[PDB]
Amino acid sequence: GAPATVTEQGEDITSKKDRGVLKIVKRVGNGEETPMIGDKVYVHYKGKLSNGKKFDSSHDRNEPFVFSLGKGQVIKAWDIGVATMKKGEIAHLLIKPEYAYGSAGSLPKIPSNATLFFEIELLDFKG
Ligand SMILES: C=C[C@@H]1[C@H]2CCC[C@@H](C(=O)N3[C@H](C(=O)O)CC[C@@H]13)N2S(=O)(=O)c1cc(Cl)cc(Cl)c1
């Protein structure tokens, strides 16, 4: 399914080139500009665990998740990944635990050593 496909066919977007965050662009967004550090970004997403189960969705809340890019307000992979996206883009990310919640996990929902899958849509970004 999509998680396997991004695992096997995604692009490494890490600066370290350690394959910790792999990406596929599913829908190409608008123009060439990606957000800048400190921008307010508006995103819809769905996340899955490696047990095959959905663990979260902003779509199901009927409103996007909003954060300031590049400030550690989210897991490292999200800061890295959303920074590569254009407005209107939909992407898949496959994230090893070193760029997510690590050995600690995040109780109750995220186990130790969890690889995470997201479908993410960048709705908007603003200074
Ligand atoms: C609103 C929740 C966000 C979502 C969406 C952005 C990525 C990631 C994350 O960086 N989060 C921040 C954090 O941990 O400081 C705040 C809480 C959490 N998660 S998440 O999808 O990985 C996530 C969802 C749930 Cl239900 C629970 C947890 Cl711990 C993480």
Task: For the beta carbon of residue 114, count every other beta carbon within 10 angstroms.
Answer: 20
Question: 47 alpha carbon to ligand 1 midpoint, in Å?
Answer: 9
* 3 state SS of 7: helix
| One-letter identity of residue 70 | G
Question: 89 alpha carbon to ligand 1 midpoint, in Å?
Answer: 20
- From which experimental method does this structure derive? X-ray
Cα 69 from Cα 123, distance rounded (Å): 14
Question: In a mutational test of the pocket of ligand 1, which residue from 65, 71, 74 has the highest number of ligand atoms less than 8 Å from its CB?
Answer: 74
Q: Kindly tell me the sign of the dihedral angle through the C-alpha atoms of 55, 60, 61, 65.
A: positive
**Of ligand 1's atoms, which has the minimum distance to the CA of residue 109?**
27
Question: In a mutational test of the pocket of ligand 1, which residue from 56, 58, 65 has the highest number of ligand atoms less than 8 Å from its CB?
Answer: 56
Question: What would the 3-class secondary structure string for 31-90 be?
Answer: CCCCCCCCCEEEEEEEEECCCCCEEEECHHHCCCEEEECCCCCCCHHHHHHHCCCCCCCE
Question: 38 alpha carbon to ligand 1 midpoint, in Å?
Answer: 18
| Burial class, 71, CB count within 10 angstroms (exposed 0-12 / middle 13-18 / buried 19+) | exposed
Indicate which residue's Cα is closest to atom 6 of ligand 1: 74
| Burial class, 82, CB count within 10 angstroms (exposed 0-12 / middle 13-18 / buried 19+) | buried
Catalytically active residues, by annotation: 45, 55-56, 75, 101, 118
* Dihedral in degrees, nearest 10, Cα atoms 59, 76, 106, 9: 70
